[PDB]
Each structure stands twice: as structure tokens, then as C-alpha cells.
Subunit: 171 residues, 3 copies
């Protein structure tokens, strides 16, 4: 793993966090408790602040960055799939970002919302809490069911465990 400062700012990573290999984190970045950053993921906090909560999982090959004056916020329990681009996005508690998705500047993903795989959420777009949105540009296609919420809950719990397991293996 690579850690780099930027103009006097360095990442603040919880001790329980898992930082996979070939990951790069730089600048003004805060990573919460039990959160896991998977393989080859890049997080450059050299434009605006980046705050990632607890028990969050940033899956493999993702890119997190920002545009001027637009902080990147990822609250507790969030799941972000493989190869996702988060650019100054605001991702509220428990949301899930489908793999291969691009979440643009100031777009706000509602609490518990689910973004389908391969979607593009345009600048400033707000996705209502607990809904399913997908497409390019992403549109809400329906609100979530209790079965969807159960699986989202299962996914983030699973990843907390996998992160701890891989963290151990890193010996």
C-alpha cells in the first residue's frame, strides 16, 4: 500500500480498517472503523476533503476523487462495488453503489438507496432514500423492498468480516 501527504494533509485511517494491496491513499482523507478498501483502489484527496465512515466497503479498482470545494462523503455502512468512480459524491448511510458505476459531482445518493451496476449518476442529481436507480443517466425505477434491504445488510456485514480476514492474512 501507498500513503502520500498533500500540501500538509495526510490520511487518518482507523486501526481496524483494512487497506488491501496496491491501494493508494493520499492527502485529506479520513477512513472510519472496520472499513475496507479493496485491491488497486485509488483515493486521492488532493482537491477537496474526503470522509469515509465506519463499516464501509470500497470494492476493487475504484477511484475516489473530488472537484474544487466539493467534498467526497461516504457515510456509515455504504457498499461501493468493483470499479466505481466516485467524484465529489455524497453517499448517505447504507447506500449501495453498483459495480461499474460513475457517481458525479455533488450528486447525492439517498440513505439506503441502491444504484444498479454500470450506472451513471450525473452532477447534482439527488437519488431519494431507499430507492433503486439505474441507467445512464440513472433514474429511479422503483423503491426498495424488504428483501432488497435484507441483502444490502448481508453484503455490508459480509465485507466487514472479509476485510478483517484479509487484514489478518496480510501478516
Amino acid at each position: 500500500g501507498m500513503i502520500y501527504p498533500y500540501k500538509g494533509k495526510t490520511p487518518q485511517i482507523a486501526a481496524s480498517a483494512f487497506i488491501a494491496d496496491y491501494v493508494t491513499i493520499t492527502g485529506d482523507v479520513v477512513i472510519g472503523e472496520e472499513t475496507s478498501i479493496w485491491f488497486n483502489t485509488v483515493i486521492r484527496g488532493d482537491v477537496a476533503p474526503t470522509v469515509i465512515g465506519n463499516r464501509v466497503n470500497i470494492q476493487d479498482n475504484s477511484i475516489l476523487h473530488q472537484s474544487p470545494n466539493n467534498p467526497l462523503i461516504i457515510e456509515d455502512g455504504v457498499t461501493v462495488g468493483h470499479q466505481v468512480i466516485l467524484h465529489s459524491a455524497i453517499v448517505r448511510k447504507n447506500a449501495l453503489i453498483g459495480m461499474g458505476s460513475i457517481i458525479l459531482d455533488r450528486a447525492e445518493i439517498g440513505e439506503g438507496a441502491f444504484i444498479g451496476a454500470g450506472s451513471l449518476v450525473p452532477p447534482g442529481k439527488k437519488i431519494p432514500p431507499n430507492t433503486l436507480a439505474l441507467g445512464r443517466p440513472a433514474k429511479v425505477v422503483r423503491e426498495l423492498t424488504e428483501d432488497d434491504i435484507r441483502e444490502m445488510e448481508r453484503i455490508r456485514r459480509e465485507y466487514v468480516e472479509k476485510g478483517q480476514y484479509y487484514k489478518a492474512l496480510q501478516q
Copy 2:
């Protein structure tokens, strides 16, 4: 090059296989002879079985993973383009996956099929063998001319050559 075991399962890589730098391979994964896994690709076998045939090429920055109970099967001679996401997908012999595509769960890609760049094959979708499928979601547009099929044999064979060449350089 990073190899990790996962819960009792450890990657089994053929001797003639080329595993590029910054590649990560974990758990229940099996890689065949003469296949090449290119730069930054991530293959996490921690959800379900992953089997990769012989003479296969998985190009740069790809992500291979699985959903529960859905193995990831990639038969012989398959060409996986740059930065592709394969999730519990079943790719039949000699098929070609265009760069930037996303093949989702239980989606089966028929033998000799050609998935156009930037495509997204939805969960459970079956793609007829010997056909060309494009779009998001991918739709079959036509059949492959003998010329197409020969360009695929040319690519497939070419990557076995490059695979062994870079493998030599590595050493």
C-alpha cells in the same frame, strides 16, 4: 503479483501461465496452461469457485468475482478485453469479451460469441454462440463472418505469444 489463500482454498496456477505485475489472485481459483492474466487485474475467489481454461487472456485492469453459489467459468481460448468486469459469468470456449464490458451473474456467453466493447450483459442472459452482441443491455445484432472468427483466432494465439514473452522478461 500477489497470491492469497481463502478459507482453505488456494490458487492453483499452471506453470506456463503468465501472471503480470500488480495482479491479485485469491482463494478458490484455477488457471490453465498458457493463459495470461494482465496488469492490475484482480481475481478474488472468495465467494464461489472460479475456473479459467487454457490459452485464455484476461487483459489489463479486469475484475473477476462471484455472487454466492454461482461459479465463474472461463473456458479455453477466451479473450477478455481491457478493464472488464466478470461477475459469476459463464464464458464459453473461444468467445471474446470487448474491453470495458460488464458480464453479470449467471449470464452465459455462447461459444465463439463476440461481445462488443463497452457492453453490459445482464444477469442470466444467454448469448447465442457465433453471434455479435452489443449495447447496454447487450442485444444480438448478427452472426460472425468467417473473417470475424479468424480475427479472433489471430488475437487468441497472439496473446499466448505475448504472454510467454512478458513471462520471460519478468524472469
Copy 3:
């Protein structure tokens, strides 16, 4: 950072160029003065020549490659966003390729053109200089305003400086 020669040709990189960690560059590749190749980017020059001008920035997780007899050309001042796939593209002076885009074989991006995020420019497609192209397939929708051009100027100016800043930390 990995630097590999290919079939007797080794990458020629200006001394002022910044090459981030986990970057892989091989073969027939020329990188100009002060350009910055960001984290996890892959530049494989093993099929056709690749020439990258000066003060260019290739952002994190991008992949540059070619098709037979189709050189990959990127002139001075070009900005290519995160996770971009450039395959035998001809990118003219000062153009900007939005993050998550796929620019295909023989496609040419006119001087100062701006490709919107997540776009796909099909093979052979030509984008007029100083225009905004969006979508998949991408389509020209309008012309760039005066401060759109001003912003583009600001962008490549910061990356030239940011690359030099990170370059120093690297040492």
C-alpha cells in the same frame, strides 16, 4: 512503477515526467516533458507506436493500448480522466477526455474538444475541435463556451504542477 521493453523497443520518458506508483509502461512509448501518468495506469506499447506529448496528464487507472498499424497519439496539453480506455485513438492538442470514457480505434478527438464523462467514441468517429461530445455512442451536442475553455486551461495547469509535487514526494 514497472518499465518493460518489448521486442527491442524501450519506453522513452522525459526526465521531467511524473510516473506514479503501480504504473506499468512497456514497449514503443514516448512520453513528453512534464506530463503526468497517474496511479495504476497501464501503457502497453506492444502492438503499435504510442506517442504522448508534453504537459499531458493521464489520470489514475487508465489503460492505453493499440490495434495493428494504428498508432496511439496524444498531443500536448491533453487531459484524460480517471479510468479511461484509449485504444489507437488520435487525441489532438488540448482536448479533454472525460473520466470513465472509452475512445476507440482510429477515432480522432479534435483540438480542444471535450468528451463528457462515461462516453464511448466508436472506431473512426471524428469529433470537431472545440466541441462537447457526450454519450454512447458519443454525439456532438454543442460548442465549448469561453469559460469552458478557461476551466480546461486551469485543469491541465494544475496537473502539471500536481505531477511535479507528487514527483518530489516520490523521491
